[PDB]
Q: What sequence folds into this?
C-alpha cells in the first residue's frame, strides 16, 4: 500500500568462494534495507545462491557426494559470511528449493504456451571434456580455458527463447524510462547493446549433458540452463503467482548488481518479464569494481587482493561496512586497501565518534553529575535534525558516501562545538551554559547515531547505551530536537572503537 521497499542482490554461484565483490553488494543492499526499515518502510531484502549446473555437479561427484548435500554445505559459506558481515536479509533463496522449481517451470510453461520458445541447433566451438561451448574470447585463444586443449566445432540440440522479438520494446522502454538503469554511464552502455540485434536466447541443454538443474516442463529430457533458472529467483522468493509477497513488493523491485552481469539484467531479464507477463522492475542499480590498492583489477597474479574477512577480523564488522559505504561512490571503480580502511577507522571512527563520546561521558560526570543535563535549545546544533531530510534522496539516489559524509560532518561539527565553547572553561563562569553545551553534544550525538545506524547497527546501538539513551530507534526521532532524557548515564562503558 503505502511506503514499500524491496531490494535484491544477485544470487551467487554456490561453489564460488565469498569475496569482496559479493561482500560489497550485499553490504550496500543491506544499508538500503536497513535505512528504509528505519524510515517506516515495509521492507523485503533478498539474497541467495546459484546452485545448479554441471561444473557444480562434477565438483560434488569428485568427493563422492550427492549434489544436493554438497550444495546444502557449500551454500553455508555465504550464509556464514552474511552473519559475520551483520547482514539482515529477510530471505535467502536457494535455487534447489521447491518453491523455486515450481515458479521456474511455471514461467517457462507460460512463455512456451505463448509461442516464444522453439527448438533448434546450437553450433560452435566446443570442449568435450568440459562438455560446454565457448567463444573466441572465452577459450584462451587456441584452446580450452579449463582443460588447455584445442576446441572442436559442434552442434547441440537446444530450446530457444524469442529474445530479439522484444528488443524494440525494451529499447523504447529504457529511452522512455531514463532512471531505469541507475548510474547513467551504464544506461548508455545498455542503450547501445539495444541499437543492435540481441538475438535469441538458448535456455536449456540436454540432461545427458547437464543432469543437475530444473527440467523443462514440456520436455523432461532437457534441463533449464542458467537464465530462466537463476533470474527467476527475484519473483520466486515472493511466491510469484498467488503469494501476497509478490503483489506487495514486486512493484518496487530494486535489483543491485555489479557491472559484470549487466547484459543478463539489462537485456535478457527484461525481455523475459515481458514475455512472462510480469511487470518490469523499478531500478537496476549497477556497481563498479573494487580495485586493488594499485588501482588495477584485483588479481592474485597481480598480488593486490583485499580480503574482507581479514579486514573484518582485524577492525570489526561495523568498521569494514562504514569504510565500504563511505569510501566508494556506487557505480565507480574504486581502489580499496587496508591502509585506507585503517586511516578512516582511526580518524572517522576512533577519533571523531569514539573519542568525543568518551570525553563527553567524562565531562558529564565532572560537570553535570554523571547524568544527562536537563534539555535546552540546540541553537547552532539544531540544524542536525534536518539531515534526515537531506540524506533520504541521497540514499535513494545511490549517494551513500555523500550521505555518510554529511552525517559525519555534523559529528565533526559537534567536536568543533565543544572544543570551541570549552565546557571546562565555562563551569567556572556559568555552569549552566556549561551543561547546555554538554546537552547539545549529547542530543547531537543521538541524532547522528540514528543516521549512522544502517551502516553500523551494533556500534551505534552501543553508543546509545554508553550515553544512557533509548537504544532502538526510528529515523523520525532524528528529525525532532530535545528527545535525549536527563537520566543517569552508565557508570561504565567500553571504548567504542578500540585501538587497532
Ligand atoms: Zn575443456
A:
Amino acid at each position: 500500500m503505502e511506503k514499500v521497499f524491496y531490494v535484491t542482490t544477485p544470487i551467487y554461484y554456490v561453489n564460488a568462494e565469498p569475496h569482496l565483490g559479493h561482500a560489497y553488494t550485499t553490504v550496500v543492499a543491506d544499508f538500503l534495507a536497513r535505512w528504509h526499515r528505519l524510515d517506516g518502510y515495509r521492507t523485503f531484502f533478498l539474497t541467495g545462491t546459484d546452485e545448479h549446473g554441471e561444473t557444480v555437479y562434477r565438483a560434488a561427484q569428485a568427493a563422492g557426494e550427492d549434489p544436493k548435500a554438497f550444495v546444502d554445505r557449500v551454500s553455508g559459506r555465504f550464509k556464514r559470511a552474511w552473519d559475520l558481515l551483520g547482514i539482515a536479509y529477510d530471505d535467502f533463496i536457494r535455487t534447489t528449493e521447491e518453491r523455486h522449481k515450481k515458479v521456474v517451470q511455471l514461467v517457462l510453461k507460460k512463455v512456451y504456451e505463448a509461442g516464444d520458445i522453439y527448438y533448434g541447433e546450437y553450433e560452435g566451438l566446443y570442449c568435450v571434456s568440459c562438455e560446454r561451448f565457448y567463444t573466441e574470447k572465452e577459450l584462451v585463444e587456441g584452446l580450452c580455458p579449463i582443460h588447455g586443449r584445442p576446441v572442436e566445432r559442434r552442434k547441440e540440440g537446444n530450446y530457444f527463447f524469442r529474445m530479439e522479438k522484444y528488443r524494440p520494446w525494451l529499447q523504447e522502454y529504457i529511452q522512455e524510462n531514463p532512471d531505469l538503469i541507475r548510474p547513467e554511464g551504464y544506461r548508455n552502455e545498455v542503450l547501445a547493446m539495444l541499437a543492435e540485434p540481441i538475438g535469441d536466447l538458448s535456455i536449456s541443454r540436454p540432461k545427458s549433458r547437464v543432469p543437475w538443474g530444473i527440467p523443462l516442463p514440456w520436455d523432461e529430457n532437457h534441463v533449464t540452463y542458467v537464465w530462466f533458472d537463476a533470474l527467476l529467483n527475484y519473483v520466486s522468493a515472493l511466491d510469484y503467482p498467488e503469494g501476497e509477497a509478490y503483489r506487495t513488493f514486486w512493484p518496487h523491485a530494486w535489483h543491485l548488481i555489479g557491472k559484470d552481469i549487466l547484459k543478463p539484467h539489462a537485456v535478457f531479464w527484461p525481455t523475459m518479464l515481458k514475455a512472462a507477463g510480469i511487470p518490469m522492475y523499478r531500478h537496476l542499480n549497477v556497481g563498479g569494481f573494487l580495485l586493488g590498492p594499485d588501482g588495477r583489477k584485483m588479481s592474485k597474479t597481480l598480488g593486490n587482493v583485499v580480503d574482507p574477512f581479514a579486514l573484518l577480523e582485524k577492525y570489526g564488522r561495523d568498521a569494514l561496512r562504514y569504510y565500504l559505504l563511505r569510501e566508494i561512490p556506487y557505480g565507480q571503480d574504486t581502489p580499496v586497501s587496508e591502509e585506507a580502511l585503517r586511516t578512516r577507522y582511526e580518524a572517522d571512527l576512533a577519533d571523531d565518534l569514539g573519542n568525543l563520546v568518551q570525553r563527553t561521558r567524562a565531562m558529564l560526570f565532572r560537570f553535570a553529575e554523571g547524568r544527562i543535563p536537563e534539555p535546552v535549545a540546540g541553537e547552532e546544533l539544531a540544524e542536525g535534525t534536518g539531515l534526515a531530510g537531506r540524506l533520504r534522496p541521497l540514499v535513494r539516489e545511490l549517494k551513500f558516501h555523500v550521505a555518510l559524509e554529511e552525517a559525519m560532518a555534523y559529528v565533526k561539527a559537534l567536536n568543533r562545538y565543544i572544543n570551541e565553547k570549552k565546557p571546562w572553561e565555562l563551569f567556572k563562569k556559568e555552569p549552566e551554559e556549561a551543561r547546555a553545551v554538554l546537552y547539545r553534544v549529547v542530543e547531537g550525538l543521538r541524532i547522528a547515531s540514528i543516521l549512522l545506524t544502517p551502516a553500523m547497527p551494533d556500534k551505534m546501538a552501543e553508543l546509545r547505551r554508553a550515553l544512557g539513551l533509548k537504544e532502538e530507534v526510528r529515523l523520525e526521532e532524528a528529525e525532532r530536537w530535545g528527545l535525549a532524557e536527563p537520566r543517569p548515564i552508565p557508570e561504565e562503558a567500553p571504548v567504542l572503537f578500540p585501538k587497532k
Notes: The chain has three domains: 1-115+227-336, 116-226, 337-500. The domain at 116-226 is CATH 2.170.220.10 (Methionyl-trna Synthetase; domain 2).
